[PDB]
Amino acid sequence: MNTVPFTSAPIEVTIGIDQYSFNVKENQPFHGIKDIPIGHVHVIHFQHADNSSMRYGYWFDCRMGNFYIQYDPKDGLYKMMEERDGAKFENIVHNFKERQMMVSYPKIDEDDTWYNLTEFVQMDKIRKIVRKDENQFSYVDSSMTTVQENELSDPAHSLNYTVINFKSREAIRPGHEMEDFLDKSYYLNTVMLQGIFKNSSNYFGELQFAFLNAMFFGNYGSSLQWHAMIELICSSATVPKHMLDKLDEILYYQIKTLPEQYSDILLNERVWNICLYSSFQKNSLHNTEKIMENKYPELL
Amino acid sequence: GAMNSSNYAELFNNDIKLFVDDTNVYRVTVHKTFEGNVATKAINGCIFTLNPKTGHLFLKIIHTSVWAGQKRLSQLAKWKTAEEVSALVRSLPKEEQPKQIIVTRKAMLDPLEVHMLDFPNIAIRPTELRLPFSAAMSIDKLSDVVMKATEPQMVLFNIYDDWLDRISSYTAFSRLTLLLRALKTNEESAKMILLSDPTITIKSYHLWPSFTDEQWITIESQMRDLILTEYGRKYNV
Numbered sequence A: 001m002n003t004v005p006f007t008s009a010p011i012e013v014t015i016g017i018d019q020y021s022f023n024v025k026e027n028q029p030f031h032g033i034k035d036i037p038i039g040h041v042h043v044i045h046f047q048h049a050d051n052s053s054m055r056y057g058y059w060f061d062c063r064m065g066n067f068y069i070q071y072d073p074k075d076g077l078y079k080m081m082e083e084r085d086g087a088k089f090e091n092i093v094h095n096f097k098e099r100q101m102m103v104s105y106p107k108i109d110e111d112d113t114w115y116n117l118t119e120f121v122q123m124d125k126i127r128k129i130v131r132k133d134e135n136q137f138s139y140v141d142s143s144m145t146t147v148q149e150n151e152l153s154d155p156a157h158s159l160n161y162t163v164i165n166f167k168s169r170e171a172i173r174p175g176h177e178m179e180d181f182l183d184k185s186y187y188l189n190t191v192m193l194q195g196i197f198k199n200s201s202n203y204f205g206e207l208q209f210a211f212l213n214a215m216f217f218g219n220y221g222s223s224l225q226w227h228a229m230i231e232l233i234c235s236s237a238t239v240p241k242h243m244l245d246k247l248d249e250i251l252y253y254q255i256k257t258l259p260e261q262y263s264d265i266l267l268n269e270r271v272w273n274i275c276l277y278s279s280f281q282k283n284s285l286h287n288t289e290k291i292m293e294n295k296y297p298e299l300l
Numbered sequence B: 001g002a003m004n005s006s007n008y009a010e011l012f013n014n015d016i017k018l019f020v021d022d023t024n025v026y027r028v029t030v031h032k033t034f035e036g037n038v039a040t041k042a043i044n045g046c047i048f049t050l051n052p053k054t055g056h057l058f059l060k061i062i063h064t065s066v067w068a069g070q071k072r073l074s075q076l077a078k079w080k081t082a083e084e085v086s087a088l089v090r091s092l093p094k095e096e097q098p099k100q101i102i103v104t105r106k107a108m109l110d111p112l113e114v115h116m117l118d119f120p121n122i123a124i125r126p127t128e129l130r131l132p133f134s135a136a137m138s139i140d141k142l143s144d145v146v147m148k149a150t151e152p153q154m155v156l157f158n159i160y161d162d163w164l165d166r167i168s169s170y171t172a173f174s175r176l177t178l179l180l181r182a183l184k185t186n187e188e189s190a191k192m193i194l195l196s197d198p199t200i201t202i203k204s205y206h207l208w209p210s211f212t213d214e215q216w217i218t219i220e221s222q223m224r225d226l227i228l229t230e231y232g233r234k235y236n237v
Helices: A086-098 A113-118 A123-129 A147-151 A177-182 A185-197 A200-217 A220-234 A241-257 A260-266 A269-278 A286-295 B073-091 B106-115 B133-138 B140-148 B169-185 B187-195 B213-235
Strands: A002-005 A013-017 A020-024 A032-036 A042-048 A051-060 A066-072 A077-083 A138-141 B017-021 B027-032 B038-043 B045-050 B056-062 B100-103 B123-125 B153-158
Touching (some): A002 A086, A013 A032, A032 A086, A042 A077, A051 A077, A051 A123, A066 A086, A077 A086, A113 A200, A113 A241, A138 A200, A177 A185, A177 B073, A185 A200, A185 A220, A200 A241, A220 A241, A241 A286, A269 A286, B017 B073, B017 B133, B045 B073, B045 B133, B045 B140, B056 B073, B056 B140, B106 B123, B133 B140, B133 B169, B133 B187, B169 B213, B187 B213
Parallel strands (some): A002 A066, B017 B100, B100 B123
Antiparallel strands (some): A002 A032, A013 A020, A042 A051, A051 A138, A066 A077, B017 B045, B027 B038, B045 B056
16 A cells, blocks of 8 residues: 655645545645555546646556655646655655544445556556656646647647547548448557557557546546547447457446536537447447446437 | 538639539439339439539449449448549649539538548538539430440530630529529429520530520520429419
8 A cells, every 4th residue: 555645735725536536725734645556557636726727637656656746836736756765755654644644545445446447557658648758657637638639739748649530541541431431440450459559458548548537637638539449449340359348348437437517528429329329339338338328318 | 611602702713623413323213023012223323523613524424333232322322422533533633633622412521531531632512502413414415425324434524515605604603503403493394495496406515505695594584484483383482
Protein backbone atom coordinates (compact mmCIF):
# COMPACT_ATOMS: atom_id res chain seq x y z
CA MET A 1 0.00 0.00 0.00
CA ASN A 2 1.56 3.34 -1.16
CA THR A 3 1.23 7.01 -0.14
CA VAL A 4 1.14 10.38 -1.94
CA PRO A 5 1.84 13.02 0.73
CA PHE A 6 0.82 16.73 0.31
CA THR A 7 3.08 19.52 1.63
CA SER A 8 -0.11 21.50 2.49
CA ALA A 9 -3.55 22.55 1.14
CA PRO A 10 -3.44 26.37 0.93
CA ILE A 11 -6.50 26.68 -1.39
CA GLU A 12 -9.97 25.15 -1.09
CA VAL A 13 -10.21 22.27 -3.59
CA THR A 14 -12.12 19.08 -4.47
CA ILE A 15 -9.45 16.28 -4.62
CA GLY A 16 -10.16 13.15 -6.68
CA ILE A 17 -8.24 9.86 -6.37
CA ASP A 18 -9.45 7.48 -9.11
CA GLN A 19 -13.31 7.30 -8.78
CA TYR A 20 -13.27 8.82 -5.19
CA SER A 21 -13.36 12.51 -4.20
CA PHE A 22 -12.97 14.62 -1.00
CA ASN A 23 -13.54 18.34 -0.23
CA VAL A 24 -10.53 20.08 1.39
CA LYS A 25 -10.90 23.57 3.02
CA GLU A 26 -8.48 26.56 2.58
CA ASN A 27 -5.49 25.80 4.94
CA GLN A 28 -7.10 22.52 6.24
CA PRO A 29 -4.33 20.37 7.83
CA PHE A 30 -4.48 17.83 4.94
CA HIS A 31 -1.23 15.87 4.22
CA GLY A 32 -2.28 13.40 1.55
CA ILE A 33 -3.60 9.98 0.55
CA LYS A 34 -2.44 6.62 1.97
CA ASP A 35 -3.28 2.88 1.38
CA ILE A 36 -3.18 3.37 -2.46
CA PRO A 37 -3.42 -0.10 -4.11
CA ILE A 38 -0.15 -1.20 -5.79
CA GLY A 39 -0.59 -2.89 -9.17
CA HIS A 40 -2.66 -0.25 -10.98
CA VAL A 41 -2.20 3.22 -12.55
CA HIS A 42 -3.95 5.96 -10.51
CA VAL A 43 -5.06 9.53 -11.20
CA ILE A 44 -5.09 12.29 -8.59
CA HIS A 45 -7.25 15.22 -9.80
CA PHE A 46 -8.27 18.69 -8.68
CA GLN A 47 -11.07 21.23 -9.06
CA HIS A 48 -10.53 24.54 -7.22
CA ALA A 49 -13.62 25.74 -5.23
CA ASP A 50 -13.07 29.28 -6.72
CA ASN A 51 -12.73 28.14 -10.41
CA SER A 52 -14.92 25.06 -11.31
CA SER A 53 -13.29 25.58 -14.78
CA MET A 54 -10.00 23.62 -15.37
CA ARG A 55 -10.24 20.15 -13.84
CA TYR A 56 -6.58 18.91 -13.92
CA GLY A 57 -4.61 15.99 -12.57
CA TYR A 58 -1.74 13.49 -12.68
CA TRP A 59 -1.58 9.85 -13.86
CA PHE A 60 1.03 7.91 -11.86
CA ASP A 61 2.11 4.44 -10.71
CA CYS A 62 3.66 4.31 -7.15
CA ARG A 63 5.98 1.44 -8.30
CA MET A 64 7.84 4.01 -10.51
CA GLY A 65 8.90 6.39 -7.68
CA ASN A 66 7.94 8.39 -4.57
CA PHE A 67 5.42 11.13 -5.57
CA TYR A 68 4.04 14.04 -3.54
CA ILE A 69 1.76 17.06 -4.20
CA GLN A 70 2.79 20.65 -3.42
CA TYR A 71 0.80 23.82 -4.16
CA ASP A 72 2.70 26.34 -6.38
CA PRO A 73 1.42 29.85 -5.55
CA LYS A 74 2.96 31.29 -8.77
CA ASP A 75 1.36 28.83 -11.30
CA GLY A 76 -1.71 28.56 -8.98
CA LEU A 77 -1.99 24.79 -8.96
CA TYR A 78 -1.36 21.56 -7.06
CA LYS A 79 1.78 20.07 -8.69
CA MET A 80 2.93 16.47 -8.60
CA MET A 81 6.69 16.10 -7.89
CA GLU A 82 9.11 13.15 -7.42
CA GLU A 83 11.13 12.86 -4.13
CA ARG A 84 14.47 11.14 -5.07
CA ASP A 85 15.62 10.85 -1.36
CA GLY A 86 13.90 7.58 -0.20
CA ALA A 87 14.73 8.18 3.51
CA LYS A 88 13.44 11.82 3.54
CA PHE A 89 10.20 10.51 1.90
CA GLU A 90 9.64 7.51 4.29
CA ASN A 91 10.35 9.95 7.18
CA ILE A 92 7.78 12.54 5.89
CA VAL A 93 5.08 9.83 5.27
CA HIS A 94 5.64 8.10 8.69
CA ASN A 95 5.19 11.54 10.51
CA PHE A 96 1.93 12.40 8.61
CA LYS A 97 0.49 8.88 9.19
CA GLU A 98 1.45 9.07 12.95
CA ARG A 99 -0.41 12.44 13.14
CA GLN A 100 -3.30 10.84 10.99
CA MET A 101 -3.37 13.86 8.64
CA MET A 102 -3.98 11.55 5.59
CA VAL A 103 -7.19 10.22 3.96
CA SER A 104 -7.26 6.48 3.27
CA TYR A 105 -7.86 5.26 -0.35
CA PRO A 106 -11.41 3.99 0.40
CA LYS A 107 -11.49 0.68 -1.54
CA ILE A 108 -14.32 -1.80 -0.65
CA ASP A 109 -12.88 -5.40 -0.64
CA GLU A 110 -15.58 -6.77 -3.11
CA ASP A 111 -15.13 -3.80 -5.49
CA ASP A 112 -13.17 -4.42 -8.76
CA THR A 113 -14.37 -1.11 -10.37
CA TRP A 114 -10.91 0.50 -10.66
CA TYR A 115 -9.22 -2.73 -11.96
CA ASN A 116 -12.10 -3.09 -14.52
CA LEU A 117 -11.66 0.55 -15.74
CA THR A 118 -7.79 0.31 -15.94
CA GLU A 119 -7.27 -3.38 -16.89
CA PHE A 120 -5.18 -2.60 -20.06
CA VAL A 121 -3.86 0.90 -19.03
CA GLN A 122 -0.04 0.98 -18.53
CA MET A 123 1.99 4.07 -17.39
CA ASP A 124 4.53 3.47 -20.23
CA LYS A 125 1.66 3.89 -22.80
CA ILE A 126 0.23 6.98 -20.97
CA ARG A 127 3.73 8.61 -21.21
CA LYS A 128 3.71 8.20 -25.07
CA ILE A 129 0.23 9.82 -25.37
CA VAL A 130 1.18 12.62 -22.83
CA ARG A 131 4.81 13.59 -23.74
CA LYS A 132 6.86 15.08 -20.83
CA ASP A 133 9.78 12.63 -20.52
CA GLU A 134 11.56 14.32 -17.54
CA ASN A 135 8.59 13.28 -15.24
CA GLN A 136 7.47 9.65 -14.47
CA PHE A 137 3.86 10.94 -14.00
CA SER A 138 1.56 12.64 -16.64
CA TYR A 139 -0.46 15.91 -16.38
CA VAL A 140 -3.87 16.09 -18.13
CA ASP A 141 -6.54 18.82 -17.96
CA SER A 142 -9.97 19.80 -19.38
CA SER A 143 -8.58 22.04 -22.20
CA MET A 144 -5.71 19.89 -23.67
CA THR A 145 -6.35 19.20 -27.38
CA THR A 146 -5.50 16.01 -29.29
CA VAL A 147 -3.00 15.66 -32.23
CA GLN A 148 -6.11 15.00 -34.48
CA GLU A 149 -7.90 18.18 -33.14
CA ASN A 150 -4.67 20.26 -33.89
CA GLU A 151 -4.75 19.04 -37.58
CA LEU A 152 -8.35 20.41 -38.13
CA SER A 153 -2.04 24.26 -31.61
CA ASP A 154 0.87 23.87 -29.02
CA PRO A 155 2.24 20.30 -29.63
CA ALA A 156 4.08 20.17 -26.19
CA HIS A 157 0.71 20.18 -24.24
CA SER A 158 -1.22 17.81 -26.64
CA LEU A 159 -2.77 14.33 -26.20
CA ASN A 160 -1.00 12.11 -28.83
CA TYR A 161 -3.85 9.56 -29.22
CA THR A 162 -3.62 7.32 -32.31
CA VAL A 163 -5.31 9.15 -35.23
CA ILE A 164 -8.42 7.27 -36.46
CA ASN A 165 -10.16 8.77 -39.54
CA PHE A 166 -12.73 6.59 -41.46
CA LYS A 167 -12.38 8.79 -44.63
CA SER A 168 -8.56 8.64 -44.95
CA ARG A 169 -6.22 6.80 -47.33
CA GLU A 170 -4.94 4.86 -44.22
CA ALA A 171 -8.53 3.55 -43.67
CA ILE A 172 -9.38 2.82 -47.37
CA ARG A 173 -7.41 0.59 -49.77
CA PRO A 174 -7.45 1.76 -53.43
CA GLY A 175 -10.00 -0.42 -55.30
CA HIS A 176 -11.74 -1.54 -52.03
CA GLU A 177 -13.41 1.87 -51.35
CA MET A 178 -16.99 0.61 -50.76
CA GLU A 179 -15.82 -2.63 -49.06
CA ASP A 180 -13.38 -0.92 -46.60
CA PHE A 181 -15.80 2.01 -45.81
CA LEU A 182 -18.81 -0.27 -45.00
CA ASP A 183 -16.66 -3.06 -43.32
CA LYS A 184 -13.73 -1.56 -41.40
CA SER A 185 -12.12 -5.02 -40.60
CA TYR A 186 -9.04 -4.22 -42.81
CA TYR A 187 -8.53 -0.90 -40.93
CA LEU A 188 -9.06 -2.50 -37.44
CA ASN A 189 -7.12 -5.78 -37.90
CA THR A 190 -4.24 -4.95 -40.38
CA VAL A 191 -3.65 -1.16 -40.03
CA MET A 192 -4.47 -0.61 -36.33
CA LEU A 193 -4.06 -3.96 -34.44
CA GLN A 194 -1.17 -5.59 -36.46
CA GLY A 195 0.31 -2.24 -37.74
CA ILE A 196 0.23 0.36 -34.92
CA PHE A 197 -1.07 -1.05 -31.56
CA LYS A 198 0.65 -4.50 -32.12
CA ASN A 199 -2.04 -6.24 -29.95
CA SER A 200 -5.62 -5.76 -28.63
CA SER A 201 -4.27 -5.04 -25.06
CA ASN A 202 -2.58 -1.74 -26.22
CA TYR A 203 -5.77 -0.83 -28.25
CA PHE A 204 -7.99 -1.40 -25.16
CA GLY A 205 -5.41 0.50 -23.00
CA GLU A 206 -5.74 3.68 -25.15
CA LEU A 207 -9.58 3.29 -25.33
CA GLN A 208 -9.78 2.99 -21.48
CA PHE A 209 -7.35 5.93 -20.99
CA ALA A 210 -9.37 8.11 -23.44
CA PHE A 211 -12.63 7.30 -21.52
CA LEU A 212 -11.11 8.15 -18.12
CA ASN A 213 -9.73 11.52 -19.41
CA ALA A 214 -13.23 12.29 -20.84
CA MET A 215 -14.94 11.39 -17.53
CA PHE A 216 -12.48 12.91 -15.02
CA PHE A 217 -11.50 16.12 -16.91
CA GLY A 218 -14.46 16.52 -19.40
CA ASN A 219 -11.70 16.45 -22.05
CA TYR A 220 -13.70 16.69 -25.32
CA GLY A 221 -10.93 15.27 -27.60
CA SER A 222 -10.57 12.23 -25.32
CA SER A 223 -14.34 11.66 -25.63
CA LEU A 224 -13.98 11.79 -29.48
CA GLN A 225 -11.10 9.23 -29.22
CA TRP A 226 -13.10 6.79 -26.97
CA HIS A 227 -16.09 6.87 -29.41
CA ALA A 228 -13.87 6.49 -32.52
CA MET A 229 -12.20 3.38 -31.03
CA ILE A 230 -15.60 1.81 -30.13
CA GLU A 231 -17.05 2.57 -33.59
CA LEU A 232 -13.98 1.11 -35.42
CA ILE A 233 -14.63 -2.27 -33.64
CA CYS A 234 -18.47 -2.21 -33.97
CA SER A 235 -18.13 -1.24 -37.73
CA SER A 236 -15.86 -4.29 -38.42
CA ALA A 237 -17.62 -7.55 -39.58
CA THR A 238 -14.49 -9.60 -38.59
CA VAL A 239 -13.25 -9.12 -34.95
CA PRO A 240 -11.53 -11.80 -32.81
CA LYS A 241 -14.19 -13.35 -30.46
CA HIS A 242 -12.04 -12.59 -27.31
CA MET A 243 -11.91 -8.88 -28.32
CA LEU A 244 -15.74 -8.62 -28.57
CA ASP A 245 -16.18 -10.40 -25.19
CA LYS A 246 -13.55 -8.09 -23.59
CA LEU A 247 -15.00 -4.90 -25.26
CA ASP A 248 -18.46 -5.77 -23.80
CA GLU A 249 -16.88 -5.98 -20.26
CA ILE A 250 -14.85 -2.75 -20.73
CA LEU A 251 -17.84 -0.65 -21.92
CA TYR A 252 -20.13 -2.18 -19.26
CA TYR A 253 -17.92 -0.86 -16.41
CA GLN A 254 -17.46 2.55 -18.21
CA ILE A 255 -21.27 3.01 -18.57
CA LYS A 256 -21.76 1.74 -14.98
CA THR A 257 -19.25 4.32 -13.60
CA LEU A 258 -20.32 7.39 -15.71
CA PRO A 259 -22.12 10.01 -13.53
CA GLU A 260 -25.86 9.84 -14.52
CA GLN A 261 -25.99 13.68 -14.92
CA TYR A 262 -23.05 13.73 -17.51
CA SER A 263 -24.66 11.13 -19.90
CA ASP A 264 -25.88 14.05 -22.18
CA ILE A 265 -22.32 15.50 -22.89
CA LEU A 266 -20.16 12.27 -22.53
CA LEU A 267 -22.23 9.88 -24.75
CA ASN A 268 -22.56 10.34 -28.56
CA GLU A 269 -26.16 9.31 -29.54
CA ARG A 270 -25.20 8.48 -33.18
CA VAL A 271 -22.26 6.21 -32.22
CA TRP A 272 -24.15 4.29 -29.46
CA ASN A 273 -27.35 3.82 -31.56
CA ILE A 274 -25.18 2.61 -34.52
CA CYS A 275 -23.02 0.29 -32.32
CA LEU A 276 -25.95 -1.34 -30.39
CA TYR A 277 -28.66 -1.47 -33.16
CA SER A 278 -27.17 -1.19 -36.77
CA SER A 279 -23.49 -2.29 -36.65
CA PHE A 280 -22.09 -5.77 -37.43
CA GLN A 281 -21.53 -6.19 -33.64
CA LYS A 282 -25.17 -5.08 -32.74
CA ASN A 283 -25.79 -8.53 -31.09
CA SER A 284 -22.25 -9.00 -29.61
CA LEU A 285 -22.34 -6.52 -26.64
CA HIS A 286 -25.07 -8.03 -24.40
CA ASN A 287 -23.83 -6.60 -21.07
CA THR A 288 -23.28 -3.12 -22.53
CA GLU A 289 -26.66 -3.08 -24.40
CA LYS A 290 -28.47 -4.16 -21.16
CA ILE A 291 -26.82 -1.49 -18.96
CA MET A 292 -27.29 1.27 -21.61
CA GLU A 293 -31.03 0.35 -22.14
CA ASN A 294 -31.70 0.35 -18.32
CA LYS A 295 -29.60 3.44 -17.41
CA TYR A 296 -29.87 5.74 -20.54
CA PRO A 297 -32.98 4.67 -22.56
CA GLU A 298 -33.47 8.41 -23.49
CA LEU A 299 -30.16 8.49 -25.48
CA LEU A 300 -31.45 5.48 -27.52
CA GLY B 1 -21.02 23.92 -48.01
CA ALA B 2 -24.40 23.33 -49.79
CA MET B 3 -25.37 25.00 -53.11
CA ASN B 4 -28.70 27.02 -52.92
CA SER B 5 -30.69 30.00 -54.45
CA SER B 6 -28.28 32.40 -52.58
CA ASN B 7 -25.00 31.16 -54.26
CA TYR B 8 -26.54 30.33 -57.71
CA ALA B 9 -24.23 32.51 -59.91
CA GLU B 10 -21.21 30.47 -58.66
CA LEU B 11 -22.33 27.79 -61.20
CA PHE B 12 -21.38 30.18 -64.09
CA ASN B 13 -17.96 31.44 -62.87
CA ASN B 14 -14.60 30.26 -64.34
CA ASP B 15 -13.92 27.54 -61.65
CA ILE B 16 -14.48 24.14 -63.39
CA LYS B 17 -17.39 22.27 -61.70
CA LEU B 18 -19.58 19.24 -62.43
CA PHE B 19 -23.06 18.29 -61.27
CA VAL B 20 -23.43 14.53 -60.69
CA ASP B 21 -26.95 12.98 -60.71
CA ASP B 22 -27.20 9.24 -59.86
CA THR B 23 -31.07 8.94 -60.13
CA ASN B 24 -30.96 6.98 -63.45
CA VAL B 25 -27.97 4.67 -62.55
CA TYR B 26 -30.02 1.73 -61.16
CA ARG B 27 -33.32 1.34 -63.09
CA VAL B 28 -35.78 -1.59 -62.81
CA THR B 29 -39.17 -2.77 -64.08
CA VAL B 30 -41.21 -4.48 -61.30
CA HIS B 31 -43.21 -7.54 -62.50
CA LYS B 32 -45.15 -10.63 -61.21
CA THR B 33 -43.47 -14.10 -61.36
CA PHE B 34 -45.31 -17.30 -62.45
CA GLU B 35 -45.80 -18.12 -58.70
CA GLY B 36 -47.38 -14.61 -58.23
CA ASN B 37 -44.36 -13.18 -56.29
CA VAL B 38 -42.79 -9.86 -57.39
CA ALA B 39 -39.34 -9.57 -59.05
CA THR B 40 -37.31 -6.74 -60.61
CA LYS B 41 -35.62 -6.74 -64.01
CA ALA B 42 -32.78 -4.19 -64.30
CA ILE B 43 -32.61 -2.03 -67.45
CA ASN B 44 -29.65 0.05 -68.70
CA GLY B 45 -28.97 3.25 -66.70
CA CYS B 46 -26.65 6.28 -66.86
CA ILE B 47 -24.67 8.70 -64.67
CA PHE B 48 -25.56 12.32 -65.59
CA THR B 49 -22.35 14.35 -65.11
CA LEU B 50 -22.78 17.94 -66.38
CA ASN B 51 -20.54 21.07 -66.61
CA PRO B 52 -23.20 23.81 -66.13
CA LYS B 53 -20.90 26.50 -67.63
CA THR B 54 -20.01 24.70 -70.93
CA GLY B 55 -22.98 22.29 -71.34
CA HIS B 56 -20.55 19.35 -71.64
CA LEU B 57 -22.42 16.19 -70.54
CA PHE B 58 -20.35 13.05 -69.70
CA LEU B 59 -23.10 10.35 -70.01
CA LYS B 60 -21.65 7.11 -68.53
CA ILE B 61 -23.96 4.30 -69.64
CA ILE B 62 -24.49 1.66 -66.91
CA HIS B 63 -25.08 -1.71 -68.61
CA THR B 64 -27.26 -4.23 -66.68
CA SER B 65 -24.26 -6.69 -66.60
CA VAL B 66 -22.66 -4.57 -63.78
CA TRP B 67 -25.47 -5.72 -61.38
CA ALA B 68 -25.04 -9.47 -62.21
CA GLY B 69 -24.54 -11.45 -58.93
CA GLN B 70 -24.42 -8.30 -56.76
CA LYS B 71 -26.54 -7.71 -53.59
CA ARG B 72 -27.98 -4.42 -52.19
CA LEU B 73 -28.01 -2.85 -55.66
CA SER B 74 -29.46 0.58 -54.60
CA GLN B 75 -26.41 0.93 -52.23
CA LEU B 76 -23.95 -0.45 -54.83
CA ALA B 77 -25.35 2.08 -57.42
CA LYS B 78 -24.04 5.02 -55.30
CA TRP B 79 -20.53 3.44 -55.06
CA LYS B 80 -20.44 2.50 -58.79
CA THR B 81 -21.45 6.15 -59.52
CA ALA B 82 -18.58 7.42 -57.31
CA GLU B 83 -16.14 4.90 -58.92
CA GLU B 84 -17.13 6.10 -62.47
CA VAL B 85 -16.94 9.87 -61.58
CA SER B 86 -13.50 9.28 -59.97
CA ALA B 87 -12.29 7.36 -63.11
CA LEU B 88 -13.61 10.29 -65.26
CA VAL B 89 -11.70 12.89 -63.20
CA ARG B 90 -8.47 10.77 -63.40
CA SER B 91 -8.94 10.46 -67.23
CA LEU B 92 -9.06 14.32 -67.64
CA PRO B 93 -5.90 16.45 -67.99
CA LYS B 94 -5.09 18.28 -64.71
CA GLU B 95 -6.24 21.70 -66.16
CA GLU B 96 -9.69 20.14 -67.05
CA GLN B 97 -10.30 18.47 -63.63
CA PRO B 98 -13.16 20.06 -61.67
CA LYS B 99 -12.43 22.17 -58.54
CA GLN B 100 -15.92 21.18 -57.17
CA ILE B 101 -18.33 18.26 -57.73
CA ILE B 102 -21.95 18.99 -56.70
CA VAL B 103 -24.10 15.84 -56.06
CA THR B 104 -27.85 16.24 -56.56
CA ARG B 105 -28.54 13.68 -53.70
CA LYS B 106 -26.87 13.75 -50.22
CA ALA B 107 -26.50 9.92 -50.23
CA MET B 108 -23.71 10.42 -52.90
CA LEU B 109 -21.50 12.53 -50.55
CA ASP B 110 -19.71 9.73 -48.64
CA PRO B 111 -19.27 7.40 -51.65
CA LEU B 112 -17.79 10.27 -53.72
CA GLU B 113 -15.61 11.68 -50.89
CA VAL B 114 -14.14 8.15 -50.29
CA HIS B 115 -13.46 7.56 -54.07
CA MET B 116 -11.86 11.05 -54.37
CA LEU B 117 -9.46 10.82 -51.31
CA ASP B 118 -6.60 11.08 -53.91
CA PHE B 119 -8.03 14.59 -54.78
CA PRO B 120 -8.14 16.45 -51.42
CA ASN B 121 -8.38 19.84 -53.27
CA ILE B 122 -11.63 18.81 -55.11
CA ALA B 123 -14.57 20.01 -52.96
CA ILE B 124 -17.53 17.54 -52.81
CA ARG B 125 -20.78 19.53 -52.20
CA PRO B 126 -24.50 18.88 -51.78
CA THR B 127 -27.19 21.26 -53.06
CA GLU B 128 -30.57 22.49 -51.68
CA LEU B 129 -31.75 23.00 -55.32
CA ARG B 130 -34.38 20.42 -56.48
CA LEU B 131 -32.79 19.93 -59.93
CA PRO B 132 -34.84 17.98 -62.49
CA PHE B 133 -31.88 15.93 -63.93
CA SER B 134 -33.89 12.64 -63.36
CA ALA B 135 -35.82 13.70 -66.52
CA ALA B 136 -32.63 13.33 -68.71
CA MET B 137 -34.07 9.96 -69.88
CA SER B 138 -37.02 11.99 -71.38
CA ILE B 139 -34.53 13.44 -73.96
CA ASP B 140 -35.09 10.96 -76.83
CA LYS B 141 -31.46 10.81 -78.09
CA LEU B 142 -30.10 10.21 -74.53
CA SER B 143 -32.76 7.52 -73.81
CA ASP B 144 -31.89 5.84 -77.23
CA VAL B 145 -28.09 5.57 -76.63
CA VAL B 146 -28.68 4.17 -73.06
CA MET B 147 -31.29 1.56 -74.18
CA LYS B 148 -29.20 0.33 -77.21
CA ALA B 149 -25.92 -0.08 -75.23
CA THR B 150 -24.65 -3.70 -75.18
CA GLU B 151 -21.61 -2.85 -72.98
CA PRO B 152 -20.40 -0.07 -70.63
CA GLN B 153 -19.86 3.10 -72.72
CA MET B 154 -19.14 6.82 -72.12
CA VAL B 155 -20.92 9.22 -74.60
CA LEU B 156 -20.16 12.98 -74.68
CA PHE B 157 -22.92 15.51 -75.50
CA ASN B 158 -23.47 19.27 -75.30
CA ILE B 159 -26.85 19.47 -73.51
CA TYR B 160 -27.10 23.16 -74.60
CA ASP B 161 -26.63 22.38 -78.38
CA ASP B 162 -25.36 25.72 -79.88
CA TRP B 163 -27.35 28.04 -77.45
CA LEU B 164 -24.08 29.48 -75.98
CA ASP B 165 -23.50 31.22 -79.40
CA ARG B 166 -26.56 33.42 -78.56
CA ILE B 167 -27.11 33.32 -74.72
CA SER B 168 -25.11 33.20 -71.46
CA SER B 169 -24.53 29.96 -69.44
CA TYR B 170 -26.91 31.35 -66.74
CA THR B 171 -29.69 31.68 -69.36
CA ALA B 172 -28.78 28.28 -70.97
CA PHE B 173 -28.98 26.50 -67.55
CA SER B 174 -32.35 28.26 -66.82
CA ARG B 175 -33.75 27.02 -70.21
CA LEU B 176 -32.41 23.46 -69.55
CA THR B 177 -33.90 23.26 -65.99
CA LEU B 178 -37.27 24.62 -67.30
CA LEU B 179 -37.38 22.01 -70.15
CA LEU B 180 -36.45 19.17 -67.76
CA ARG B 181 -38.90 20.39 -65.04
CA ALA B 182 -41.67 20.35 -67.77
CA LEU B 183 -40.64 16.87 -69.04
CA LYS B 184 -40.62 15.58 -65.40
CA THR B 185 -44.11 17.02 -64.52
CA ASN B 186 -45.97 15.97 -67.71
CA GLU B 187 -43.69 14.23 -70.25
CA GLU B 188 -46.40 13.82 -73.00
CA SER B 189 -47.48 17.52 -72.80
CA ALA B 190 -43.81 18.76 -72.68
CA LYS B 191 -42.86 16.64 -75.78
CA MET B 192 -46.04 17.78 -77.70
CA ILE B 193 -44.97 21.43 -77.01
CA LEU B 194 -41.40 20.77 -78.31
CA LEU B 195 -42.33 18.86 -81.55
CA SER B 196 -45.91 20.10 -82.50
CA ASP B 197 -44.62 22.29 -85.45
CA PRO B 198 -42.91 19.87 -87.92
CA THR B 199 -41.05 22.74 -89.74
CA ILE B 200 -38.67 23.08 -86.70
CA THR B 201 -36.35 20.05 -86.64
CA ILE B 202 -33.61 18.64 -84.38
CA LYS B 203 -30.22 18.76 -86.16
CA SER B 204 -28.43 15.33 -86.30
CA TYR B 205 -25.69 16.76 -83.89
CA HIS B 206 -28.26 18.28 -81.41
CA LEU B 207 -30.68 17.14 -78.70
CA TRP B 208 -33.35 19.92 -78.93
CA PRO B 209 -35.13 21.64 -81.89
CA SER B 210 -33.55 24.53 -83.84
CA PHE B 211 -35.79 27.31 -82.39
CA THR B 212 -35.20 31.01 -83.23
CA ASP B 213 -34.80 33.46 -80.26
CA GLU B 214 -38.54 34.37 -80.76
CA GLN B 215 -39.68 30.69 -80.91
CA TRP B 216 -37.67 29.93 -77.68
CA ILE B 217 -39.65 32.69 -75.80
CA THR B 218 -42.96 31.08 -76.98
CA ILE B 219 -41.67 27.55 -76.09
CA GLU B 220 -40.43 28.74 -72.65
CA SER B 221 -43.91 30.37 -72.06
CA GLN B 222 -45.71 27.08 -72.98
CA MET B 223 -43.43 25.14 -70.49
CA ARG B 224 -44.09 27.58 -67.58
CA ASP B 225 -47.91 27.31 -68.25
CA LEU B 226 -47.62 23.43 -68.36
CA ILE B 227 -45.75 23.49 -65.00
CA LEU B 228 -48.22 25.89 -63.21
CA THR B 229 -51.38 23.96 -64.41
CA GLU B 230 -49.95 20.59 -63.23
CA TYR B 231 -49.17 22.32 -59.89
CA GLY B 232 -52.85 23.48 -59.49
CA ARG B 233 -54.02 19.90 -60.36
CA LYS B 234 -51.47 18.15 -58.03
CA TYR B 235 -52.50 20.38 -55.06
CA ASN B 236 -56.16 21.38 -55.89
CA VAL B 237 -55.22 25.15 -55.66
